[PDB]
Design a protein around this ligand. Structure first.
Ligand SMILES: [Cl-]
Ligand SMILES: [Cl-]
Ligand SMILES: [Cl-]
Ligand SMILES: [Cl-]
Ligand SMILES: [Cl-]
Ligand code: NA
Length: 129
């Protein structure tokens, strides 16, 4: 599923991401835009053989099991394929664990390079929330 901007904002708000660990909703929408272009089915392989999955590009090196990342962890206790669903619940619940692990949203490289320090409120402007 390719979400619209305001559609995704509303879904993320319903799932408790607005101001989660102090990160306003626009931060999460901005991260999803540049990680996946709002596409739940996005995948990208990393140099070390791990793979990033879904709307927030969660990495199999630490967070999910895909059966092909030897020596990795599965800290969200899910198959990585569950992060490609049109229902974003699994991605949101795993993202909550990630952002709580000490480094905040700096875990998302695209957030650090394209959202951090910008006017992220623009990403929810005009949306009925
Ligand atoms: Cl957009
Ligand atoms: Cl915001
Ligand atoms: Cl594995
Ligand atoms: Cl949902
Ligand atoms: Cl933080
Ligand atoms: Na893994």
């Amino acid at each position: 599923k390719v979400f619209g901007r305001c559609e995704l904002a509303a879904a993320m708000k319903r799932h408790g991401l607005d101001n989660y660990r102090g990160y306003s909703l626009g931060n999460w929408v901005c991260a999803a835009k540049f990680e996946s272009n709002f596409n739940t089915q996005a995948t990208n392989r990393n140099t070390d053989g791990s793979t990033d999955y879904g709307i927030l590009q969660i990495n199999s090196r630490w967070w999910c099991n895909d059966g092909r990342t030897p020596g990795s962890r599965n800290l969200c206790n899910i198959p990585c394929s569950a992060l490609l669903s049109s229902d974003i619940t699994a991605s949101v619940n795993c993202a909550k664990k990630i952002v709580s692990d000490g480094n905040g949203m700096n875990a998302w490289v695209a957030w650090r390079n394209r959202c951090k320090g910008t006017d992220v409120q623009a990403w929810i402007r005009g949306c009925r929330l």
